Amino acid sequence: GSSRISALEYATTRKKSEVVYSGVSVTIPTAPTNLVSLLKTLTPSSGTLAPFFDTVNNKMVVFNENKTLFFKLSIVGTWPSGTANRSMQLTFSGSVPDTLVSSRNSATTTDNILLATFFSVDKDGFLATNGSTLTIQSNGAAFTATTIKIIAEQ
Amino acid sequence: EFGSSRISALEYATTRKKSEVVYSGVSVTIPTAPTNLVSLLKTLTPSSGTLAPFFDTVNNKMVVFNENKTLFFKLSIVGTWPSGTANRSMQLTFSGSVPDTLVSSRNSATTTDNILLATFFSVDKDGFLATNGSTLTIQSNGAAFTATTIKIIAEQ
Amino acid sequence: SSRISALEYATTRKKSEVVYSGVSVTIPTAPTNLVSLLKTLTPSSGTLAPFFDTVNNKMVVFNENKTLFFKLSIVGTWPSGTANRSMQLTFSGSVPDTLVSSRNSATTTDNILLATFFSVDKDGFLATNGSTLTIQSNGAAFTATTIKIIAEQ
Ligand SMILES: N[C@@H](CCC(=O)O)C(=O)O
Ligand SMILES: N[C@@H](CCC(=O)O)C(=O)O
Ligand SMILES: N[C@@H](CCC(=O)O)C(=O)O
């Protein structure tokens, strides 16, 4: 069945946004900050925010499919020298909001960050209709990001 | 050949199976002692979703389909530790051939108490998870935690 | 016929899942090539091949537009009394990724679970170069007694 086969091929084709900002100086402040708003002003080194990051409404958006979305944010940067307790926090709005935190303390010298998660998108569900506002906040002190890689795939 | 049967099998293979359960507007203590998570949740009435088929409420464990398909797990908890709690963490252990221990730790720099634990389990046909399931044991560290919304997902 | 067989390939998981049991392995406080460390140990089950290259001491991937999922589960210990402590794992790449599992006095368990994914592109950086995995223990060295490592694609 060519039509059923084509549907299976579509279902098993990864769709994604994978955007790299190399050589930027993005301050991630200590106050809640819309992440897409922060990124959309920057010229990417590679990739595009579309289709998963909507630069008009400053949100992550998804395809209307019963297919899970995988998300990763990799940040190279620094907190100020001497900052001990510190964390990077990223919240996704949703029916139940999800709050990611990468915390560290005096024991860890590296300031680089890797946040990863997934969203089990339902057809005609909350994410499919509303998208998700991503709100980022640096805790302990402001963070200065010099490379950012952001991925959403479904 | 077996074309028809193989297409139907592929349709099954690419259909997500899931439990996605939300408990909204609750007030649930996650204590500092090890607590069977399924035992804790099954006392609550879901606002949406069902524990079946991934959470066995007789044996109080997560169970999986016997197929070479990875299971993705997420636990999202809205709640609080007592005011002033500085060092604190939420931990979740899954029994297995090698047990896995998830920890979300934080300190004075982070004021939010909300928790997001996510992972995967690479289920093998006739393997440990498929044969035994996994006991999930949750524990709050620093002080007891009071959860007001819980969302739990297992999918395969 | 062939589109069906191709779909069967596309939807079949490929994996390395290696368990090292009953070991007492120091993960030092200095950067350490993880594949170099593991390949000295005898697995209780599984094989480093095909995802872990023990000649160049790196993770390697299939040259396919298919995401790789990675998990490292470690049973072990920091020295008694260690409060602030963390385990970190860096993957080289076009942009390197640094995973950190940190904890403090509130947490008693020392066991570690690091999980992530890599959105491999055909003929992309990972497919062309692989990834060097560098592990480091912070606060004090960590003694690992069971290690389970998974890469799947
Ligand atoms: N099923 C929810 C997402 C659940 C999740 O947070 O993964 C939705 O479609 O909006
Ligand atoms: N392959 C193991 C699971 C490994 C993992 O922890 O992901 C099983 O089938 O029980
Ligand atoms: N697309 C990148 C991987 C991106 C990631 O780190 O997930 C590659 O093929 O090398």
Short mmCIF file of all heavy atoms in Angstrom, two decimals, chain A residues 2 5-6 8-9 12 14 16 18 20 22 70-72 74 76 102-108 110 112-114 116-117 147 149 151 153, chain C residues 1 3-4 7 10-11 64-67 69 84-86 88 95-100 102-104 115-121 136 138-139:
data_model
loop_
_atom_site.label_atom_id
_atom_site.label_comp_id
_atom_site.label_asym_id
_atom_site.label_seq_id
_atom_site.Cartn_x
_atom_site.Cartn_y
_atom_site.Cartn_z
N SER A 2 0.96 1.90 -1.16
CA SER A 2 1.83 3.06 -1.32
C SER A 2 1.41 4.25 -0.42
O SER A 2 2.24 5.05 0.04
CB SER A 2 1.85 3.48 -2.79
OG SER A 2 2.74 4.55 -3.02
N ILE A 5 2.41 3.23 3.11
CA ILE A 5 3.86 3.30 3.19
C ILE A 5 4.35 4.75 3.26
O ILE A 5 5.22 5.07 4.08
CB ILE A 5 4.51 2.55 2.01
CG1 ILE A 5 4.27 1.05 2.18
CG2 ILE A 5 6.01 2.83 1.93
CD1 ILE A 5 4.65 0.22 0.97
N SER A 6 3.78 5.62 2.44
CA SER A 6 4.17 7.02 2.46
C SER A 6 3.89 7.65 3.82
O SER A 6 4.68 8.45 4.31
CB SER A 6 3.45 7.79 1.35
OG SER A 6 3.87 7.34 0.09
N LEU A 8 3.90 6.07 6.67
CA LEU A 8 4.91 5.54 7.56
C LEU A 8 6.25 6.23 7.37
O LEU A 8 6.97 6.52 8.34
CB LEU A 8 5.08 4.03 7.34
CG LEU A 8 3.98 3.18 7.97
CD1 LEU A 8 4.00 1.80 7.35
CD2 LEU A 8 4.14 3.08 9.47
N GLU A 9 6.60 6.53 6.12
CA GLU A 9 7.82 7.26 5.83
C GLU A 9 7.77 8.67 6.43
O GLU A 9 8.73 9.12 7.06
CB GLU A 9 8.09 7.27 4.33
CG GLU A 9 8.48 5.87 3.84
CD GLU A 9 8.41 5.68 2.34
OE1 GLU A 9 7.65 6.44 1.71
OE2 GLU A 9 9.04 4.73 1.81
N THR A 12 8.24 8.56 10.26
CA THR A 12 9.59 8.21 10.68
C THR A 12 10.65 9.17 10.15
O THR A 12 11.85 8.91 10.28
CB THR A 12 9.93 6.75 10.30
OG1 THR A 12 9.74 6.54 8.90
CG2 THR A 12 9.05 5.79 11.08
N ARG A 14 12.44 12.59 10.80
CA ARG A 14 12.66 13.60 11.82
C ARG A 14 12.52 14.99 11.18
O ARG A 14 13.07 15.24 10.11
CB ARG A 14 14.06 13.43 12.40
CG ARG A 14 14.37 14.35 13.57
CD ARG A 14 15.78 14.12 14.12
NE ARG A 14 16.75 14.43 13.07
CZ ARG A 14 17.98 13.96 12.99
NH1 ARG A 14 18.47 13.15 13.92
NH2 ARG A 14 18.72 14.30 11.93
N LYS A 16 13.07 19.08 12.36
CA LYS A 16 13.72 19.78 13.46
C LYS A 16 14.13 21.21 13.16
O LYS A 16 14.28 21.60 12.01
CB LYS A 16 14.89 19.02 14.03
CG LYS A 16 16.06 19.03 13.18
CD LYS A 16 17.23 18.35 13.89
CE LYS A 16 18.37 18.21 12.95
NZ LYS A 16 19.57 17.54 13.50
N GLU A 18 17.45 23.23 14.46
CA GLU A 18 18.73 23.09 15.13
C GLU A 18 19.52 24.34 14.82
O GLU A 18 19.97 24.52 13.70
CB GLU A 18 19.48 21.84 14.65
CG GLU A 18 20.90 21.75 15.21
CD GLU A 18 21.54 20.37 15.05
OE1 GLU A 18 20.82 19.35 15.14
OE2 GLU A 18 22.78 20.30 14.89
N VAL A 20 22.49 27.18 15.82
CA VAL A 20 23.72 27.45 16.53
C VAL A 20 24.04 28.93 16.40
O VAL A 20 24.07 29.48 15.30
CB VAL A 20 24.89 26.62 15.97
CG1 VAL A 20 26.21 27.02 16.61
CG2 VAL A 20 24.63 25.13 16.19
N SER A 22 27.15 30.99 17.35
CA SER A 22 28.54 30.92 17.79
C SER A 22 29.04 32.35 17.80
O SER A 22 28.75 33.12 16.88
CB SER A 22 29.39 30.10 16.81
OG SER A 22 28.95 28.76 16.74
N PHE A 70 11.58 16.19 21.11
CA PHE A 70 12.78 16.17 21.92
C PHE A 70 13.46 17.53 21.85
O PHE A 70 13.57 18.10 20.76
CB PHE A 70 13.71 15.03 21.48
CG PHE A 70 13.12 13.68 21.75
CD1 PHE A 70 12.31 13.07 20.82
CD2 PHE A 70 13.28 13.07 22.99
CE1 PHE A 70 11.72 11.85 21.10
CE2 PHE A 70 12.69 11.85 23.26
CZ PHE A 70 11.91 11.25 22.33
N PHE A 71 13.88 18.02 23.01
CA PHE A 71 14.41 19.37 23.15
C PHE A 71 15.77 19.34 23.82
O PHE A 71 15.95 18.64 24.83
CB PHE A 71 13.47 20.24 24.00
CG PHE A 71 14.01 21.60 24.29
CD1 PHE A 71 13.72 22.67 23.47
CD2 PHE A 71 14.85 21.82 25.37
CE1 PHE A 71 14.23 23.91 23.70
CE2 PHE A 71 15.37 23.07 25.60
CZ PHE A 71 15.06 24.11 24.77
N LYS A 72 16.72 20.10 23.29
CA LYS A 72 18.02 20.26 23.96
C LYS A 72 18.53 21.68 23.81
O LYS A 72 18.40 22.28 22.75
CB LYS A 72 19.05 19.27 23.37
CG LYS A 72 20.39 19.21 24.09
CD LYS A 72 21.25 18.02 23.66
CE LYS A 72 21.73 18.16 22.24
NZ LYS A 72 22.86 17.26 21.94
N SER A 74 22.14 23.65 24.67
CA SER A 74 23.53 23.55 25.06
C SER A 74 24.11 24.95 25.05
O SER A 74 24.02 25.63 24.04
CB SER A 74 24.28 22.65 24.08
OG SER A 74 25.63 22.52 24.45
N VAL A 76 27.46 27.36 26.07
CA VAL A 76 28.82 27.63 26.50
C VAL A 76 28.85 29.08 26.99
O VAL A 76 28.41 29.98 26.28
CB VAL A 76 29.83 27.48 25.34
CG1 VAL A 76 31.24 27.84 25.79
CG2 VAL A 76 29.79 26.07 24.79
N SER A 102 19.38 23.34 36.09
CA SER A 102 20.71 22.78 36.18
C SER A 102 21.46 23.59 37.22
O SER A 102 21.87 24.72 36.95
CB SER A 102 21.43 22.83 34.84
OG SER A 102 22.71 22.23 34.95
N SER A 103 21.62 23.01 38.39
CA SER A 103 22.21 23.68 39.54
C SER A 103 23.61 23.19 39.77
O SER A 103 23.93 22.03 39.48
CB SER A 103 21.39 23.37 40.78
OG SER A 103 21.91 24.06 41.91
N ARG A 104 24.45 24.06 40.31
CA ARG A 104 25.78 23.65 40.72
C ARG A 104 26.26 24.58 41.84
O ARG A 104 25.55 25.50 42.28
CB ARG A 104 26.74 23.58 39.53
CG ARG A 104 26.89 24.86 38.76
CD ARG A 104 27.55 24.63 37.40
NE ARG A 104 26.66 23.90 36.50
CZ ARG A 104 26.91 23.68 35.21
NH1 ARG A 104 28.02 24.12 34.65
NH2 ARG A 104 26.02 23.04 34.46
N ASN A 105 27.45 24.28 42.33
CA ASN A 105 27.98 24.92 43.51
C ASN A 105 29.50 25.00 43.42
O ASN A 105 30.07 24.81 42.34
CB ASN A 105 27.50 24.16 44.75
CG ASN A 105 27.89 22.71 44.73
OD1 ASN A 105 29.04 22.38 44.42
ND2 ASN A 105 26.95 21.82 45.04
N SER A 106 30.15 25.33 44.53
CA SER A 106 31.58 25.54 44.59
C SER A 106 32.42 24.38 44.06
O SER A 106 33.58 24.58 43.67
CB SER A 106 32.00 25.82 46.05
OG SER A 106 31.72 24.71 46.87
N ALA A 107 31.87 23.17 44.05
CA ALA A 107 32.65 22.03 43.62
C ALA A 107 32.91 21.99 42.12
O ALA A 107 33.89 21.38 41.68
CB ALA A 107 31.99 20.73 44.08
N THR A 108 32.04 22.63 41.35
CA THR A 108 32.12 22.56 39.89
C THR A 108 32.66 23.85 39.32
O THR A 108 32.07 24.91 39.54
CB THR A 108 30.73 22.28 39.29
OG1 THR A 108 30.20 21.07 39.86
CG2 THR A 108 30.79 22.13 37.79
N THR A 110 33.27 24.31 35.83
CA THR A 110 32.65 24.63 34.55
C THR A 110 31.31 25.34 34.73
O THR A 110 30.53 25.02 35.62
CB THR A 110 32.49 23.39 33.63
OG1 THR A 110 31.98 23.83 32.38
CG2 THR A 110 31.54 22.36 34.20
N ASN A 112 29.43 25.61 31.79
CA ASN A 112 28.68 25.20 30.61
C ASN A 112 27.46 24.38 30.99
O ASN A 112 27.47 23.64 31.99
CB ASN A 112 29.61 24.46 29.65
CG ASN A 112 30.72 25.35 29.11
OD1 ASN A 112 30.64 26.58 29.17
ND2 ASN A 112 31.81 24.74 28.68
N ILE A 113 26.40 24.50 30.20
CA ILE A 113 25.07 24.00 30.56
C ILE A 113 24.49 23.12 29.48
O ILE A 113 24.62 23.44 28.29
CB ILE A 113 24.12 25.18 30.77
CG1 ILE A 113 24.65 26.05 31.92
CG2 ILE A 113 22.70 24.72 31.06
CD1 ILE A 113 24.21 27.48 31.87
N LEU A 114 23.84 22.04 29.88
CA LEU A 114 23.12 21.17 28.96
C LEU A 114 21.79 20.83 29.60
O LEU A 114 21.74 20.18 30.65
CB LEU A 114 23.93 19.91 28.63
CG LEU A 114 23.48 19.09 27.42
CD1 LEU A 114 22.14 18.42 27.65
CD2 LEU A 114 23.45 19.93 26.15
N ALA A 116 18.10 19.03 28.66
CA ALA A 116 17.41 18.21 27.67
C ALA A 116 16.13 17.66 28.26
O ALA A 116 16.07 17.37 29.46
CB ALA A 116 18.29 17.09 27.21
N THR A 117 15.11 17.50 27.43
CA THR A 117 13.85 16.94 27.88
C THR A 117 13.04 16.50 26.66
O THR A 117 13.53 16.54 25.53
CB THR A 117 13.09 17.95 28.75
OG1 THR A 117 12.03 17.26 29.41
CG2 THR A 117 12.56 19.14 27.94
N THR A 147 28.33 30.69 23.20
CA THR A 147 27.78 29.82 22.17
C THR A 147 26.49 29.20 22.69
O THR A 147 26.43 28.75 23.83
CB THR A 147 28.77 28.72 21.73
OG1 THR A 147 29.94 29.34 21.17
CG2 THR A 147 28.16 27.82 20.67
N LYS A 149 23.40 26.44 21.37
CA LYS A 149 22.85 25.48 20.42
C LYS A 149 21.48 25.07 20.95
O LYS A 149 21.38 24.60 22.09
CB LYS A 149 23.78 24.28 20.27
CG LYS A 149 23.20 23.12 19.47
CD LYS A 149 24.20 21.97 19.28
CE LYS A 149 24.67 21.41 20.62
NZ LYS A 149 25.57 20.23 20.48
N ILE A 151 17.87 22.92 20.00
CA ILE A 151 17.27 21.89 19.16
C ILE A 151 15.88 21.56 19.64
O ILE A 151 15.67 21.30 20.83
CB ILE A 151 18.13 20.59 19.16
CG1 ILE A 151 19.48 20.85 18.51
CG2 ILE A 151 17.41 19.43 18.46
CD1 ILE A 151 20.53 19.79 18.79
N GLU A 153 12.97 18.76 18.00
CA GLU A 153 12.75 17.83 16.90
C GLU A 153 11.54 16.96 17.16
O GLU A 153 11.26 16.56 18.29
CB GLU A 153 13.98 16.96 16.67
CG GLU A 153 14.36 16.06 17.83
CD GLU A 153 15.64 15.32 17.56
OE1 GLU A 153 16.64 15.97 17.18
OE2 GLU A 153 15.67 14.07 17.71
N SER C 1 7.56 -3.93 -0.97
CA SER C 1 8.82 -4.67 -1.02
C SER C 1 9.98 -3.87 -0.41
O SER C 1 10.17 -3.88 0.81
CB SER C 1 9.14 -5.09 -2.46
OG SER C 1 10.34 -5.85 -2.52
N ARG C 3 10.55 -0.58 0.05
CA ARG C 3 10.21 0.52 0.96
C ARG C 3 9.80 -0.05 2.33
O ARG C 3 10.06 0.57 3.36
CB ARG C 3 9.11 1.41 0.39
CG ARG C 3 9.59 2.20 -0.79
CD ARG C 3 8.49 2.89 -1.54
NE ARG C 3 7.96 4.05 -0.84
CZ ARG C 3 6.87 4.70 -1.23
NH1 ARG C 3 6.21 4.30 -2.31
NH2 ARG C 3 6.45 5.77 -0.56
N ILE C 4 9.17 -1.23 2.34
CA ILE C 4 8.82 -1.88 3.59
C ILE C 4 10.08 -2.33 4.34
O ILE C 4 10.21 -2.10 5.54
CB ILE C 4 7.89 -3.08 3.36
CG1 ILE C 4 6.56 -2.60 2.77
CG2 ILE C 4 7.63 -3.83 4.66
CD1 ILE C 4 5.67 -3.73 2.29
N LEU C 7 11.78 0.64 5.82
CA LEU C 7 11.09 1.08 7.02
C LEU C 7 11.40 0.20 8.21
O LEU C 7 11.52 0.70 9.33
CB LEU C 7 9.58 1.15 6.79
CG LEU C 7 9.07 2.42 6.10
CD1 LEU C 7 7.69 2.18 5.52
CD2 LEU C 7 9.05 3.57 7.08
N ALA C 10 14.68 1.38 9.38
CA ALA C 10 14.56 2.71 9.97
C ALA C 10 14.01 2.66 11.39
O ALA C 10 14.35 3.52 12.21
CB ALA C 10 13.65 3.56 9.11
N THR C 11 13.18 1.66 11.67
CA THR C 11 12.50 1.56 12.95
C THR C 11 13.11 0.49 13.85
O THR C 11 12.55 0.21 14.91
CB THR C 11 11.01 1.26 12.74
OG1 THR C 11 10.85 0.06 11.97
CG2 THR C 11 10.31 2.42 12.05
N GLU C 64 23.39 8.42 9.58
CA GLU C 64 21.95 8.33 9.36
C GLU C 64 21.30 9.53 10.00
O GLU C 64 21.76 10.01 11.04
CB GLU C 64 21.38 7.05 10.01
CG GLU C 64 22.03 5.79 9.49
CD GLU C 64 21.59 4.51 10.16
OE1 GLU C 64 20.63 4.52 10.98
OE2 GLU C 64 22.19 3.47 9.83
N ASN C 65 20.20 10.00 9.41
CA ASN C 65 19.41 11.08 10.00
C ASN C 65 18.51 10.51 11.08
O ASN C 65 17.28 10.47 10.94
CB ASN C 65 18.60 11.74 8.90
CG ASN C 65 19.47 12.52 7.95
OD1 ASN C 65 20.29 13.34 8.37
ND2 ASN C 65 19.37 12.20 6.67
N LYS C 66 19.14 10.04 12.15
CA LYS C 66 18.44 9.37 13.24
C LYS C 66 19.11 9.77 14.54
O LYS C 66 20.32 9.70 14.66
CB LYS C 66 18.46 7.85 13.07
CG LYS C 66 17.58 7.12 14.07
CD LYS C 66 17.58 5.63 13.84
CE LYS C 66 16.57 4.92 14.72
NZ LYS C 66 16.75 3.44 14.66
N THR C 67 18.32 10.22 15.49
CA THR C 67 18.85 10.68 16.78
C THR C 67 19.38 9.53 17.62
O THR C 67 18.83 8.42 17.63
CB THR C 67 17.76 11.48 17.47
OG1 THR C 67 17.59 12.66 16.68
CG2 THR C 67 18.10 11.83 18.92
N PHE C 69 20.36 8.29 21.41
CA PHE C 69 20.06 8.49 22.83
C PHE C 69 21.16 7.86 23.66
O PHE C 69 21.62 6.75 23.37
CB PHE C 69 18.68 7.91 23.16
CG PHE C 69 17.56 8.69 22.52
CD1 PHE C 69 17.14 8.39 21.24
CD2 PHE C 69 17.02 9.78 23.15
CE1 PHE C 69 16.14 9.15 20.64
CE2 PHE C 69 16.03 10.53 22.56
CZ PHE C 69 15.60 10.22 21.30
N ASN C 84 29.46 19.22 48.87
CA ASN C 84 29.36 19.66 47.49
C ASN C 84 30.17 18.75 46.58
O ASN C 84 31.35 18.53 46.80
CB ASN C 84 29.83 21.11 47.36
CG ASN C 84 28.84 22.11 47.95
OD1 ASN C 84 27.77 21.76 48.44
ND2 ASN C 84 29.21 23.38 47.90
N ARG C 85 29.54 18.25 45.53
CA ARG C 85 30.21 17.31 44.66
C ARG C 85 29.42 17.21 43.36
O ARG C 85 28.21 17.47 43.34
CB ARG C 85 30.31 15.95 45.34
CG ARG C 85 28.98 15.30 45.73
CD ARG C 85 29.15 14.40 46.97
NE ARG C 85 28.00 13.52 47.20
CZ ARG C 85 26.87 13.85 47.82
NH1 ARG C 85 26.70 15.06 48.33
NH2 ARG C 85 25.90 12.95 47.94
N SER C 86 30.07 16.85 42.27
CA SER C 86 29.36 16.65 41.01
C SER C 86 30.12 15.72 40.09
O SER C 86 31.31 15.53 40.23
CB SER C 86 29.12 17.97 40.28
OG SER C 86 30.31 18.43 39.68
N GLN C 88 30.65 15.30 35.92
CA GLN C 88 30.48 15.98 34.64
C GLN C 88 30.99 15.13 33.49
O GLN C 88 31.90 14.32 33.64
CB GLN C 88 31.14 17.35 34.64
CG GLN C 88 32.63 17.33 34.46
CD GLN C 88 33.22 18.73 34.56
OE1 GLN C 88 33.09 19.39 35.58
NE2 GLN C 88 33.87 19.17 33.49
N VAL C 95 29.29 22.12 18.56
CA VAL C 95 29.21 22.78 19.85
C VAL C 95 29.32 21.68 20.89
O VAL C 95 28.50 20.76 20.89
CB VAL C 95 27.87 23.51 20.03
CG1 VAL C 95 27.77 24.14 21.41
CG2 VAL C 95 27.69 24.57 18.93
N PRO C 96 30.32 21.75 21.79
CA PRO C 96 30.46 20.70 22.81
C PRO C 96 29.33 20.76 23.81
O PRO C 96 28.84 21.85 24.14
CB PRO C 96 31.77 21.06 23.50
CG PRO C 96 31.90 22.55 23.31
CD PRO C 96 31.33 22.81 21.95
N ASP C 97 28.91 19.61 24.31
CA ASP C 97 27.86 19.54 25.33
C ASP C 97 28.45 19.06 26.64
O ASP C 97 29.15 18.05 26.68
CB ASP C 97 26.77 18.53 24.94
CG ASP C 97 25.92 18.95 23.77
OD1 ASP C 97 26.09 20.06 23.22
OD2 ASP C 97 25.05 18.13 23.39
N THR C 98 28.13 19.76 27.73
CA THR C 98 28.62 19.39 29.06
C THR C 98 27.47 19.09 29.98
O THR C 98 26.72 19.98 30.38
CB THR C 98 29.48 20.50 29.68
OG1 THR C 98 30.60 20.75 28.84
CG2 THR C 98 30.00 20.08 31.04
N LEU C 99 27.35 17.81 30.32
CA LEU C 99 26.38 17.32 31.28
C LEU C 99 26.96 17.42 32.68
O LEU C 99 28.13 17.09 32.90
CB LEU C 99 26.03 15.85 31.01
CG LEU C 99 25.53 15.42 29.63
CD1 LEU C 99 25.15 13.95 29.60
CD2 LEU C 99 24.35 16.24 29.19
N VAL C 100 26.14 17.86 33.63
CA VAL C 100 26.56 17.94 35.02
C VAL C 100 25.46 17.40 35.92
O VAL C 100 24.29 17.75 35.78
CB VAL C 100 26.86 19.40 35.43
CG1 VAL C 100 27.24 19.49 36.90
CG2 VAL C 100 27.97 19.99 34.57
N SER C 102 25.06 17.60 39.82
CA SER C 102 25.60 18.20 41.03
C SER C 102 24.73 17.87 42.22
O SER C 102 23.51 17.72 42.09
CB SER C 102 25.66 19.71 40.86
OG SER C 102 26.22 20.33 42.00
N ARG C 103 25.33 17.79 43.40
CA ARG C 103 24.57 17.66 44.62
C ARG C 103 25.37 18.25 45.78
O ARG C 103 26.48 18.77 45.62
CB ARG C 103 24.13 16.21 44.85
CG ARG C 103 25.28 15.22 44.88
CD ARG C 103 24.79 13.78 44.70
NE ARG C 103 24.30 13.57 43.34
CZ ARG C 103 23.91 12.40 42.83
NH1 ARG C 103 23.94 11.31 43.58
NH2 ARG C 103 23.50 12.31 41.56
N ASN C 104 24.76 18.20 46.95
CA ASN C 104 25.27 18.88 48.12
C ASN C 104 24.89 18.06 49.36
O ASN C 104 24.45 16.91 49.25
CB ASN C 104 24.73 20.32 48.15
CG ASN C 104 23.23 20.39 48.12
OD1 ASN C 104 22.55 19.66 48.86
ND2 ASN C 104 22.69 21.27 47.29
N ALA C 115 21.73 11.48 31.18
CA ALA C 115 21.08 11.07 29.94
C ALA C 115 20.93 12.28 29.03
O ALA C 115 20.76 13.39 29.50
CB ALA C 115 19.74 10.48 30.23
N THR C 116 21.01 12.03 27.73
CA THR C 116 20.86 13.07 26.75
C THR C 116 20.59 12.45 25.38
O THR C 116 20.43 11.23 25.26
CB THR C 116 22.10 13.97 26.74
OG1 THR C 116 21.81 15.14 25.97
CG2 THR C 116 23.34 13.26 26.19
N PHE C 117 20.53 13.29 24.36
CA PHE C 117 20.43 12.82 22.99
C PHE C 117 21.30 13.69 22.08
O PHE C 117 21.68 14.79 22.46
CB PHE C 117 18.98 12.76 22.49
CG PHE C 117 18.33 14.12 22.29
CD1 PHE C 117 18.37 14.76 21.06
CD2 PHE C 117 17.64 14.74 23.32
CE1 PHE C 117 17.76 15.98 20.88
CE2 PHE C 117 17.03 15.96 23.14
CZ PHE C 117 17.09 16.57 21.91
N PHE C 118 21.58 13.16 20.90
CA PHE C 118 22.35 13.83 19.86
C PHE C 118 21.62 13.68 18.55
O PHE C 118 21.38 12.57 18.09
CB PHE C 118 23.76 13.25 19.76
CG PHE C 118 24.53 13.41 21.02
CD1 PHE C 118 24.53 12.41 21.97
CD2 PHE C 118 25.21 14.58 21.30
CE1 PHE C 118 25.20 12.57 23.17
CE2 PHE C 118 25.89 14.73 22.49
CZ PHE C 118 25.88 13.73 23.42
N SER C 119 21.27 14.81 17.95
CA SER C 119 20.46 14.81 16.75
C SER C 119 21.35 14.67 15.52
O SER C 119 21.63 15.63 14.79
CB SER C 119 19.64 16.09 16.69
OG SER C 119 18.70 16.00 15.65
N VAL C 120 21.83 13.45 15.31
CA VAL C 120 22.80 13.14 14.27
C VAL C 120 22.23 13.45 12.90
O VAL C 120 21.13 13.00 12.55
CB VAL C 120 23.20 11.65 14.32
CG1 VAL C 120 24.14 11.30 13.18
CG2 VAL C 120 23.84 11.30 15.65
N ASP C 121 23.01 14.18 12.11
CA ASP C 121 22.73 14.42 10.70
C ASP C 121 23.63 13.56 9.82
O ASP C 121 24.83 13.41 10.10
CB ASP C 121 23.01 15.87 10.36
CG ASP C 121 22.12 16.83 11.11
OD1 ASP C 121 20.93 16.53 11.27
OD2 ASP C 121 22.62 17.89 11.54
N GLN C 136 34.77 13.77 34.45
CA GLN C 136 35.51 14.34 35.55
C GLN C 136 34.63 14.38 36.78
O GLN C 136 33.46 14.77 36.70
CB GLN C 136 35.99 15.75 35.19
CG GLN C 136 36.71 16.50 36.27
CD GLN C 136 37.16 17.84 35.79
OE1 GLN C 136 37.93 17.93 34.83
NE2 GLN C 136 36.65 18.90 36.40
N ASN C 138 34.05 16.00 40.57
CA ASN C 138 34.32 17.28 41.22
C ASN C 138 34.01 17.21 42.71
O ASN C 138 33.01 16.63 43.11
CB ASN C 138 33.49 18.37 40.57
CG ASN C 138 33.81 18.53 39.11
OD1 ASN C 138 34.97 18.73 38.75
ND2 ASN C 138 32.80 18.44 38.27
N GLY C 139 34.86 17.83 43.51
CA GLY C 139 34.72 17.83 44.96
C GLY C 139 35.72 16.87 45.60
O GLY C 139 36.37 17.20 46.60
#
